[PDB]
Design a protein around this ligand. Sequence first.
Ligand SMILES: Cn1nc(N2CCCC2)nc1CCc1nc2ccc(C(F)(F)F)cn2n1
Ligand SMILES: [Mg+2]
Ligand SMILES: [Zn+2]
Length: 313
Amino acid sequence: GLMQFTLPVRLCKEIELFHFDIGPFENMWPGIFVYMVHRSCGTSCFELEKLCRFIMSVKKNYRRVPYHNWKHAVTVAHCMYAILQNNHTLFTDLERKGLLIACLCHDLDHRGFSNSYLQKFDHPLAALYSTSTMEQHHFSQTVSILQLEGHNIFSTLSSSEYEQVLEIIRKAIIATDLALYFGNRKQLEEMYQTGSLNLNNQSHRDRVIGLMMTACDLCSVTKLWPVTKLTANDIYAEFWAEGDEMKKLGIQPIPMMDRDKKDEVPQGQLGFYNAVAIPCYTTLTQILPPTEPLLKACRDNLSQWEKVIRGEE
Ligand SMILES: Cn1nc(N2CCCC2)nc1CCc1nc2ccc(C(F)(F)F)cn2n1
Ligand SMILES: [Mg+2]
Ligand SMILES: [Zn+2]
């Protein structure tokens, strides 16, 4: 009840910054998450015993794949923590509660394969969920873990508060399907520019939380250059394993997944920064000005990838 979580001084100061890296000590990541819930939500948001049992069941349902692993989950939750702390007064109590949980859970039981590969392999999940295949699965695993005994961290919510939070989590997790992001950002672009954007409009909130989810999910491109660069290796380790599997099904993978195109990686990063990341943090900075450090960090990593192409590293 009178029990704070406290971090060492360097972590206590740097965790508040968007570019924070959670570090290589896996055993500290639960405490980092709890620290973030307590400061973002309060020490009274969740029964600590239920929260710790929930964090450990979530951790246990992430697989040991190179990128879509427990470290990604906690990293995406830390970006979300940084957005919520820099926009204190824009978000309900339920949203604060829901969005950190959504981020921790958003890739539950990922196998390191795209929706596209599941559909080509004809995986049972691709017959159960025609679109956003992995993302409906991730929300489904979230509800399972929540329904385990001693795991209902939302036990103290009213019936209707409970349903609102699960609905915030569902839409947040669906929104992490990057196929949906392009249309969502386009609409947000238009609404902000015509000045129709209205945060009391619930369907507008939804779009804005959706874009926050994309921003947190892509936050590897907003870290210090050495973190960004080494995460790219984990990212391609997954994509190229998928490319191998595509070739096994008798299909030429897209170039992004073909390890035979290792050489073109620097140029694949530019496309990705120009086509996805920059537009994402731009529209986010317009809508939520204190998130500008994500845009600035993304542009610095783009300029680092341009240096790589010019042979300056
Ligand atoms: C479109 N494209 N084409 C290639 N190629 C390589 C040579 C041939 C083409 N690479 C790509 C981009 C893939 C990518 N990079 C990143 C970095 C960070 C992140 C995340 F953490 F933000 F999510 C996601 N991705 N996704
Ligand atoms: Mg995902
Ligand atoms: Zn993710």
